[PDB]
Design a protein around this nucleic acid. Structure first.
Lengths: 94, 136, 104, 71, 135, 38
RNA sequence: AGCCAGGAUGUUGGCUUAGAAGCAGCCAUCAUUUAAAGAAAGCGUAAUAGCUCACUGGUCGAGUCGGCCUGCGCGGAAGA
């Protein structure tokens, strides 16, 4: 079990998403299966420590998003390209 | 000393060096030397640094060099009242952007490889870090 | 330092020469001790003692024979005729066709 | 006096005069475990192991170091 | 040095040996070189003495397992324990020739009949015979 | 005294101290290893 | 962290070397003793020895070890 909290995003785009990495969050997306894609945001430090462990990428994860649990796999991950950080994670629904 | 075998053109524009790198991931090996700043490795630099890390592992291991000096660079000789054409090609460079992986190693442990890439880093003009491979 | 070095030289000669007196008494013994029981297979298997002792003695010679740094290398040979007209120039050839026909 | 070194008593047992130049890759002899126990029991003045198998594994350590396999 | 789980292995292992143990001897560790320490443990495993040193706050957990809770005064200062499974006495002679031959250090107590016995009265455990006296 | 912009513990005995604005390396066991940062 | 004691046995591991005995260089991955100790961490011998750390029990009695990310600072820093 790897639990994550989130929030749905009000804003989006370059200006909005750069303000998130100023505030120690970062943006990600949940797509896949049937539904509309969902835009979410995550505490950076939480999910940095989790993705250290290589079970992050094998296992099924559990994103809480306004009460509703969702079960998702880590499909893709953009890193910031020298400092050890994260700029975005794609979460396919399983 | 690295240098293409043949090209189309002898001489090249100066260009600029903006933006971030392609070739950010450690693909070939376990560890790697990522650049953090932004400049040019000459070909003599790239070699001096290979000879450091090669010496330092005692030839265990395998080393990959991910960057190649394929831009040529001219200098005018001493006293040349400007003009009268572009200079001769003295030497070759790769351009480096923040995030390019430069060397990769595997077939050694992370004790030794940290020390090898520290001994390389002292020969290069740009600020560097050590990186391990990520699984995705 | 020099005395232990000189003992290391004089051991290499005196050990190897005394064990070739006793080693060719061993081989002349133990080939002939195969003839006393008189088996032709023990007669040929005790020859394996000798051809070990041959390339200890043949490598002690090679240590004297050649010695200086260049004695491995390829060589030139300059034959020159002396001072007596034709009779001397014939003698020079006579050689050339000697050192060629022994380097063959 | 003491019993002579374990390297000298393994050289007679294998049938060699000096050991291996680059050990464990290169191998220059052999010994069965009857001879390992005879070398163990001849050294049983010197050795600080209480039993035999304990003495024998000490002699196996010198055999690995000089190239000799334990056939 | 160790985990909380590795010290739980020692509480189970040393409590279990105390059941098999008839007699037991507390001693001292320091003073003595490994040549002369190993002379104690060679002649130890001839007479049948399971020699140990365990940590001395830790041994209050390991020797709760009865009746050797006598020996809780002794764990202030150094403690080479012993637990003698076969053959009663045995060790108490050998810890006094260990004491004399080096000529240092304390040698505190020795537990038999489920009771603490102080240093001058070990003469009874020291001059027990072999088991194996009546034949 | 060795004076140099990179001071470094050489032996295990060497100790880095800051005296009066300045990084030094005092070694007990080796007088050579005495260093200062200029 | 300090403080006291132990850091051994086959064995100078093997091979090289005038010598190489943990400690010039090269190859290497034992058990035994059990509190635990490298077939060797730094001084040092012509070589052993000598010292000493890893490692380990004793003593003592509350927080501590060292990486990552970020702010402001120190040295590096000599001219008429």
């Amino acid at each position: 079990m790897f639990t994550i909290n989130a929030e749905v995003r009000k804003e989006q785009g370059k200006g909005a998403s750069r303000r998130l990495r100023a505030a120690n969050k970062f943006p990600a997306i949940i797509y896949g299966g049937k539904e509309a894609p969902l835009a979410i945001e995550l505490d950076h430090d939480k999910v940095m420590n989790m993705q250290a462990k290589a079970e992050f990428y094998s296992e099924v994860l559990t994103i809480v998003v306004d009460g509703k649990e969702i079960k998702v796999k880590a499909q893709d991950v953009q890193r910031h390209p020298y400092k050890p950080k994260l700029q975005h994670i794609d979460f396919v629904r399983a | 000393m690295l240098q293409p075998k043949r090209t189309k053109f002898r001489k090249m524009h100066k260009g600029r060096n903006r933006g971030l790198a392609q070739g950010t991931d450690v693909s070939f090996g376990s560890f790697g030397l990522k650049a953090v700043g932004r400049g040019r490795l000459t070909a003599r630099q790239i070699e001096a640094a290979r000879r450091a890390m090669t010496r330092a592992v005692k030839r265990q291991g395998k080393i990959w060099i991910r960057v190649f000096p394929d831009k040529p660079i001219t200098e005018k000789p001493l006293a040349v009242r400007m003009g009268k054409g572009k200079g001769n090609v003295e030497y070759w460079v790769a351009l480096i952007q923040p995030g390019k992986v430069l060397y990769e190693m595997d077939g050694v442990p992370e004790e030794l490889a940290r020390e090898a890439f520290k001994l390389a880093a002292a020969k290069l003009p740009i600020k560097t870090t050590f990186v391990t491979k990520t699984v995705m | 330092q020099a005395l232990g070095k000189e003992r290391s030289s004089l051991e290499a000669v005196v050990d190897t020469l005394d064990q070739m007196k006793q080693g060719l008494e061993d081989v002349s013994g133990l080939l002939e001790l195969a003839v006393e029981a008189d088996d032709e297979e023990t007669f040929n298997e005790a020859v394996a003692e000798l051809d070990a002792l041959e390339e200890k003695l043949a490598q002690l010679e090679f240590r004297r024979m050649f010695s200086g740094e260049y004695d491995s290398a390829d060589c030139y040979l300059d034959i020159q005729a002396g001072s007596g007209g034709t009779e001397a120039q014939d003698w020079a050839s006579m050689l050339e066709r000697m050192y060629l026909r022994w380097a063959e | 006096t003491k019993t002579p070194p374990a390297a000298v008593l393994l050289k007679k047992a294998a049938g060699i005069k000096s050991g291996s130049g680059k050990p464990n890759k290169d191998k220059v002899g052999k010994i069965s475990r009857a001879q390992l126990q005879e070398i163990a029991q001849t050294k049983a003045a010197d050795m600080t192991g209480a039993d035999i198998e304990a003495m024998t594994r000490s002699i196996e350590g010198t055999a690995r170091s000089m190239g000799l396999v334990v056939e | 040095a160790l985990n909380l789980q590795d010290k739980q292995a020692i509480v189970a292992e040393v409590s279990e040996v105390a059941k098999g143990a008839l007699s037991a001897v507390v001693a001292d560790s320091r003073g003595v070189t490994v040549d002369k320490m190993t002379e104690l443990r060679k002649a130890g495993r001839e007479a049948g003495v399971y020699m140990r040193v365990v940590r001395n706050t830790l041994l209050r957990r390991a020797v709760e397992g009865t009746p050797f809770e006598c020996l809780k005064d002794a764990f202030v200062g150094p403690t080479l324990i012993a637990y003698v499974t076969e053959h009663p006495g045995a060790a108490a002679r050998l810890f006094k020739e260990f004491a004399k031959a080096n000529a240092k250090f304390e040698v505190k107590a020795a537990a038999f009949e489920g009771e603490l016995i102080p240093a001058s009265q070990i003469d009874r455990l020291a001059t027990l015979p072999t088991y194996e006296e009546a034949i | 005294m060795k004076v140099r912009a990179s001071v470094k513990k050489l032996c295990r005995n060497c100790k880095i101290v800051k005296r009066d604005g300045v990084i030094r390396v005092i070694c007990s066991a080796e007088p050579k290893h005495k260093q200062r940062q200029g």
